[PDB]
């Protein structure tokens, strides 16, 4: 097994696998038209055909393109080169980055839209539920739901947990007795199961359960019958995608699971493609799929309306952070 890539923004991990730990150059300059600029370049050959991989980062976006070069003898100067991957660039000259730690500051800026840990939600839909409270108040698990939870991940005591918590309570034990968690790739996934989360008596919205699942971006929904579901049954500013999972009595060895997505017309197509039966295993086969689908699901929402707006301001701020560091540190490599 080698496995397909996680559907994070592909253009992020470029620097990582082409520039880092190999010979490149990093330059910075101040364009008053586009903002702070942090721009890398690598001269490389494939076969005997010489190319020139460029990567320029703006207050806003990050531009990539490969440019071939013959014995074109002229090496396009750094300003020309910049303009060959982004035309709106209009600067006097670029200044070279000379801080020997720079490559690590840079890789860490590009790889900030890839995340190492995930908090997902789990909800049980019983009988023929429709509203919010019908779901969020369900106590005591279905036979199928119990079987499902131990298969999906390992049970873990929260009371002295060393890994990624995801907003849950370790020390005081305020949030749930136990939970479900697993280590997927080099990624850490923590689930917020409603039934495992603490119950309040008389509470309509069930706030103690809805504080976690409500701040989740993606969540699983486990059914027993074929009771319909939409992203409107639940009211949340954060939940943008749901994975529907339903049990079957048509499996002599392992129950069959009917699986389907429920997007908001805000999120793109994502995840490993859904099989033509739309049915699944009971073993590690399906488990591996589901988690990729959820991880790819969140990465899909990153592009959606709500998060992209916030991301815009984060990116520019983190760029200024970086731009400063490469400026001051490159300067005190000679002074001035």
Q: Find the count of extended strands (DSSP E, 2+ residues).
A: 12
Q: How far is the first residue's CA from the last residue's CA?
A: 54 Å
Radius of gyration: 25 Å
Strand-and-helix sequence, N→C?
A: HEEEEHEHEHHEEEHEEEHH
Keywords: Golgi apparatus, GTPase activation, Membrane, Phosphoprotein
Subunit structure: Homodimer and heterodimer with RAP1B.
Membrane topology: Peripheral membrane protein
Protein name: Rap1 GTPase-activating protein 1
Can you describe this structure?
By secondary structure, the chain is of the alpha+beta class. It folds into 2 domains: 9-113 and 304-336, Arylsulfatase, C-terminal domain, CATH 3.30.1120; 114-303, 3-Layer(aba) Sandwich (Rossmann fold), CATH 3.40.50.11210. It has 8 helices and 12 strands. It has helices at residues 14-18, 78-83, 102-110, 133-136, 143-152, 207-213, 284-301, 305-331, and strands spanning 25-31, 35-46, 49-57, 62-68, 95-96, 117-125, 154-157, 178-183, 188-193, 218-223, 241-246, 258-262. It has a 7-stranded mixed sheet. Helix 3 (102-110) packs antiparallel against helix 8 (305-331). The longest helix has 27 residues, at 305-331. The protein is elongated, with a radius of gyration of 25 Å. 29% of the residues are buried. This is Rap1 GTPase-activating protein 1. It is found in: Golgi apparatus membrane. GTPase activator for the nuclear Ras-related regulatory protein RAP-1A (KREV-1), converting it to the putatively inactive GDP-bound state.
